[PDB]
Amino acid sequence: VDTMVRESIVAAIGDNQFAHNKIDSWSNNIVEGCLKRLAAMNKPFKYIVTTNLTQKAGAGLHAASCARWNEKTDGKLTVQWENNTMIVLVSVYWLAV
Amino acid sequence: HKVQAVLKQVLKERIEKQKYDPVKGAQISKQLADDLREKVKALGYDRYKLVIQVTVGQKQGQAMRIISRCLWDQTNDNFASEYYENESMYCVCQVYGLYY
């Protein structure tokens, strides 16, 4: 489910380089791309999609996300990507209806 | 927002007199995230949930911004952002107030 997302991300921003004024824009396109990736699966759920992108500048970081949800129907899926100067994180969250 | 103001109060109440530290930072950031979760999951919970993001950084003064593009169920999912800085710690919080 997320492997096609990862291949989409490696297709979109593979080995590319930072430019800050379109960085958010890439995020938007990624969010739209992942939206189509959600719209291809269309499981009847409440979906949440989020991206993060950050320059490799030399500060150490740690990241994850949590909630307090109905544990059997609500879930999280993720893809981390990186290159020489950038880090990319995409997250999808399932809440049931 | 009242809740946002008290979440920023929680941010300071964590990080006052402090500086960002690589060695304290795993436990410090776990305490940060869990304390903001405990804030939003205290009184003020009415069959909701909160989805959380936290960023903590050292002070260098380059060009940095935040943005987030989502798709959500519209009437039940809301969002807010918080920024703060001090002598050595930048801290940003992103809160997603969603119906459980």
Give the integer Cα–Cα distance in Å for B82 and A48: 20
User: Nearest CA of chain B to the CA of A4: how many Å?
Assistant: 19
Query: What letters, b where the CB count within 10 A reaches 16 and e where it falls short, cover B10-21?
Result: bbeebbeeeebe
**Residue type at A69 in one-letter notation:** W
Method used to determine the 3D structure? cryo-EM
Q: Taking the domains of chain A in order of start, what are their residue ranges?
A: 1-97
Element housing B7 (H / E): helix B2-15
Q: What resolution (Å)?
A: 7.5
Burial of B43 (0-12, 13-18, 19+ CB in 10 A): exposed
Strand extents, DSSP E, B1-100? 48-58, 78-85, 89-99
User: Closest to A46 (Cβ–Cβ): which among B52, B68, B73?
Assistant: B73
Strand extents, DSSP E, A11-85? 45-55, 75-82
DSSP A13: S
Kindly state the tokens that stand for B48: 């909701």
Give the residues across from A78 on adjacent strands: A91
Give the integer Cα–Cα distance in Å for A46 and A64: 20
Whether the CB of A56 is below 8 Å from some CB of chain B: the reply is no
Torsion, Cα A15 A21 A26 A27, to 10 degrees, reads: 120
3-state SS class at A63: coil
Kindly state the tokens that stand for B59: 């002070």
